[PDB]
Ligand binder design. Sequence first.
Ligand SMILES: Cc1cc2nc3c(=O)[nH]c(=O)nc-3n(C[C@H](O)[C@H](O)[C@H](O)COP(=O)(O)OP(=O)(O)OC[C@H]3O[C@@H](n4cnc5c(N)ncnc54)[C@H](O)[C@@H]3O)c2cc1C
Ligand SMILES: Cc1cc2nc3c(=O)[nH]c(=O)nc-3n(C[C@H](O)[C@H](O)[C@H](O)COP(=O)(O)OP(=O)(O)OC[C@H]3O[C@@H](n4cnc5c(N)ncnc54)[C@H](O)[C@@H]3O)c2cc1C
Lengths: 649, 649
Amino acid sequence: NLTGDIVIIGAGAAGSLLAHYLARFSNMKIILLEAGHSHFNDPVVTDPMGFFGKYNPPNENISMSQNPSYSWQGAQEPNTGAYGNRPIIAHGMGFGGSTMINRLNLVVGGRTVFDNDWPVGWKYDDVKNYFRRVLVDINPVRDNTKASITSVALDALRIIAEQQIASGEPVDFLLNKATGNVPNVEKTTPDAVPLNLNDYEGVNSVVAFSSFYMGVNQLSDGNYIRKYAGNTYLNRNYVDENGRGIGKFSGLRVVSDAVVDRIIFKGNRAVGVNYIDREGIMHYVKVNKEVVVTSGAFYTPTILQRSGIGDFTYLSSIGVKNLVYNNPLVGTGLKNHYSPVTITRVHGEPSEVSRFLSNMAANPTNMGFKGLAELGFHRLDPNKPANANTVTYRKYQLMMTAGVGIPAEQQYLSGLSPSSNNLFTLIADDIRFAPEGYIKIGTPNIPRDVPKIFFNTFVTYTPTSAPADQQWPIAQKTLAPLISALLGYDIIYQTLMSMNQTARDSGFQVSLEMVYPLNDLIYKLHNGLATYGANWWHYFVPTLVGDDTPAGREFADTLSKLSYYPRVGAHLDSHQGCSCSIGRTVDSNLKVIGTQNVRVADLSAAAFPPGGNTWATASMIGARAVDLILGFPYLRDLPVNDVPILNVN
Amino acid sequence: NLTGDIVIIGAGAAGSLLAHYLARFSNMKIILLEAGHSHFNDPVVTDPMGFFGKYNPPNENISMSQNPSYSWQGAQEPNTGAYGNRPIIAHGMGFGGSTMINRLNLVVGGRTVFDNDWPVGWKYDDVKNYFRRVLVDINPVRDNTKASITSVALDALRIIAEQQIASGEPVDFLLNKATGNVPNVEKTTPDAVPLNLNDYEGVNSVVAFSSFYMGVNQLSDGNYIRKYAGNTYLNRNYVDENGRGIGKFSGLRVVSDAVVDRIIFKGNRAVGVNYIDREGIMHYVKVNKEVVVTSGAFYTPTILQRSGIGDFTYLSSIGVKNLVYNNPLVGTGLKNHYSPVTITRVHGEPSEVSRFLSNMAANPTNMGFKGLAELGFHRLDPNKPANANTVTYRKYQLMMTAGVGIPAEQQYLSGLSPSSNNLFTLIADDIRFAPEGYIKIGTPNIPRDVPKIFFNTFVTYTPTSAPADQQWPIAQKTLAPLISALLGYDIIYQTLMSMNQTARDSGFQVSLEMVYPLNDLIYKLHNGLATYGANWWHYFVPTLVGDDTPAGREFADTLSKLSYYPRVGAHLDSHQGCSCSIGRTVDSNLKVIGTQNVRVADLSAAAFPPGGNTWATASMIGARAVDLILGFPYLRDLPVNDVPILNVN
Ligand SMILES: Cc1cc2nc3c(=O)[nH]c(=O)nc-3n(C[C@H](O)[C@H](O)[C@H](O)COP(=O)(O)OP(=O)(O)OC[C@H]3O[C@@H](n4cnc5c(N)ncnc54)[C@H](O)[C@@H]3O)c2cc1C
Ligand SMILES: Cc1cc2nc3c(=O)[nH]c(=O)nc-3n(C[C@H](O)[C@H](O)[C@H](O)COP(=O)(O)OP(=O)(O)OC[C@H]3O[C@@H](n4cnc5c(N)ncnc54)[C@H](O)[C@@H]3O)c2cc1C
């Protein structure tokens, strides 16, 4: 049998990093078990554009996240907040996990969220060097192509930011505490300095910029390669084609196509791990010291559950025989981000529209993103943290892309065609998305793509018989996701209105019109915000409001109709996390509560979703686990100019 | 250390029956392996109303077919014919397979399909006694409640049938060859004789009736029980609590919660089967004579594929190590039925609309079904079999239910609320559904809920630069499912128009209006059919017609808009089959081609979908397999008064 000191389950964002550095910094036997295999010669993976379907066979034109050979297919239970829909969300399956198949937008997530929403020992100053490590190992690039529309948008945000700052209003979506009197918006002059949303000390909590950072590297021939956790940490300089570590890393063993079932215990000590190879043959891996689970937010809790760690009453009820530790929180607290989509039409002469929409095409250095911002709370969002006026929280990630990013059914219903060259997309991604779900294995025998995944989003509030005044604080919480999504629309509406001015100022003879969701509805929403102020959202529940005026009914109707759009004019993000989080399933040392020697070190350990895309945070947790397991800050202390050497093969 | 002569994988409609009679009629060791377990003490299953959610916990209100503890979750790949949608279709998981979780409508499927679309040796006179056996073993019941609307509908169909008959038209949807001059519509007089769609000699190919037959039995206390393959064949009179067969059935052994991986071969002979128990422990089952695979249309081929039987080039590409026989047809030819939904509004005084819609509520004896028919081809369907004028083919199953059976998103968009008591549902289920798909495992290691399942339905036809006359036969095939679905709408439109006359004749002061799909669009469809006749469907491809008149353009628009409704105003049936069919993956003796001793005996073996719900055919195939394996018509010859004795525990 295979025997290791530390046995790691899942070679994803966290597991790949963890394995690599444990081997480098210890004399221990490290075993990494991964369900998939390496894709170092697969252009679908190695070419960043493969993500967009560049190498898809025409008769099987599906993305990696839709393809069972490339991913786990996490089909969730009917979404009561979106007409019973059942989105299928992936974890990548191979060396690098989801970073093998993701869109490569590398975002740390900001200082504020770690300082406030994560526990002692996990504050931003505790993790910033691990984040720095994660970033320098990848060495992401900025967009190689400046688009005029990006400067027009920035200048529009500059204006709004100025409006908000001047008003003295304590919280609004472009305010940033750390940057004093000046709009924290990137300048659009010739030699403008880029603003860096990932700035080391976290100054740029709320910030507008021309470019995100993509996890790609340019090769000496000028081509780009996906630079992800798989090829960064498990390439042929470090692990040979048979999975055996090389030189200083010879303590490492990576087992490809090893589908782990469960962890075997003696009392509350893990002593072994079972997996099944591609021949359907079962193997036992002996564990000398620790097991670390890094199988992603959906699956890490399912491994723990099958292994006997979780809700005993439920596990017993479905026939899990060997029970180890009762913790009903295992798999609960599932979080994600969520991206409603808006579409804008640019009016004017064709040549002028064309010029205005030029230089937006996706390439590896930008993955389609032409800006724009990490934004704060809208002033009219009633659900801000208690101290939101004294520290700046991230609430939306604002993205601009070419094309028409709504689902095909919505393109049909709206009449907005992806082949119309006068349309483009803006997305205010809710990155403090209020819904919470949970994961439960349905059966005890084997890992399955489809455990029970409950994640309900834009649910309705059903009035009770209690006095209205007692109900409003309940409705406020229930409606939080709808409230935030509609405010996201208004943010975008505001931005476009200012772009109508800044486009002209920059010499473009064009006008911009928000056309998805319906212009008339957004117009009405904007007017309602001004009319009803803070309690505007009461009109989500008209039977409790008691405004039987034509105006009141119309505004209720406007919110009713608008509630449709975040439900289906949208995509659920693949940023699932927090299902085994610090303080609930594991302690601050990432040790699974009730066990001697099991840890969780992937995004499922995250205490609260980062303010932006989740790859960085997932690897960061793995990074910290290296130093937690070895008992000294080896990885934190590693100089930043010492980075893994990339071997393409 | 299990050893059996016949090892059967999957206790479904086919497997349960097969196991039971093989044990009864032989002295062999029969082993049945099932991924799930028995639910004989589970009211969700045993109470027929449990299907509709009667015992759902309110916080996890999901149907059995949505629940991973009760079913396999077959999430298919994006449907190119329905906006990339990914419906998740179940196979039941437990004693009885899908009959454990289905809606219990027991339909043979008619003589015509077996006589014409099934090969020699599988014609209707070959299978009719096996069908009779499947039926008597269940002993299904008729609807215990007469509803007036049913009689109104029947009389309306009577009229239309008379007119079709009178017209001398060779094929139309209410014509039935075997019944001469008279409409084959059940009479509505006081002492009317029920018409039986499952009549032994298959006279009633096309037929309208007041009641389907539900797989339920009434107990002596008056309560109803689900009567399905699980409790019929594997109850405690036959199999004890440890899975050991009793008395005459003592050669049978049923292993519960046994998730089978693959079949082990020595050359092309199966010698073993692997499975994993609920503790994750792998077991080898030795095979003395034969393996029979009965794991359902989605999963039977995935077992064969992991076992090395399928497309060698594909299987190697995803890591299947042991290759046994090259047959690329394995898993191809997937078929299903498909149910677009229509909604009708009933106009008139409330007490009169209410009187008219009374007695429609679902109970165990009807499972919501209040009629109505097995219908033939619409006269204007260009895709009839060559001999459709000389023998009567089933094309639609017409069902009437109370309520609003469109999906929740469509209820919202349409403004048709499930709480409106003046609405009801009619469905023309396409049971000669043209689309064809296929199943391919994504990974080699273990069974998965989610192999690749490609099933594209209402795909578009893209005009080329070739002459019109040369393109039309292609478009005719490509558009076949839309054509048939829209003609289903016209059938119902016709039916409702005649119901407006018969409702009045029957003393109801009401009017009926089709309101989903939009009344205006259906009105325009009906008129276009009359105007353009046989080539009406050319207007699906307006650029090829070259009719630039306002009338022509409007009809093109009408068909365009209507094409939306079968795509999303519908449900994909759970009647998946034919993925390992006779003549492609197995021979007419159900032996897997290329193997000495493996058979497929479930619905995946079906040569062509039955004309109606598929449980009966699935059990029929298993029934025949008994006699094929034992080498004599033992089960065929068993007197119909000898049936399994039911034990509830
Ligand atoms: C389509 C898509 C787009 C995304 N876009 C971005 C983006 O642009 N930017 C960004 O920051 N984030 C994005 N993400 C999210 C990000 O990639 C993940 O959040 C991050 O990888 C999480 O890392 P992880 O270690 O926690 O889990 P994962 O990266 O998902 O790794 C899990 C690993 O565990 C393995 N595993 C699971 N079960 C088993 C088992 N039983 N046995 C053995 N191995 C097992 C899996 O195969 C997998 O390799 C995207 C994700 C997806 C799917
Ligand atoms: C929700 C629903 C509604 C339906 N409604 C109707 C209806 O009203 N009328 C009707 O006639 N038909 C209906 N059906 C369809 C009908 O039930 C099926 O067509 C019929 O049961 C098919 O029988 P089968 O033997 O081919 O496979 P199944 O009945 O589906 O049984 C397959 C069995 O194989 C087992 N299995 C699969 N993989 C493995 C493995 N690796 N190891 C061990 N065991 C395995 C499964 O657990 C299952 O028990 C419905 C089906 C569903 C799911």
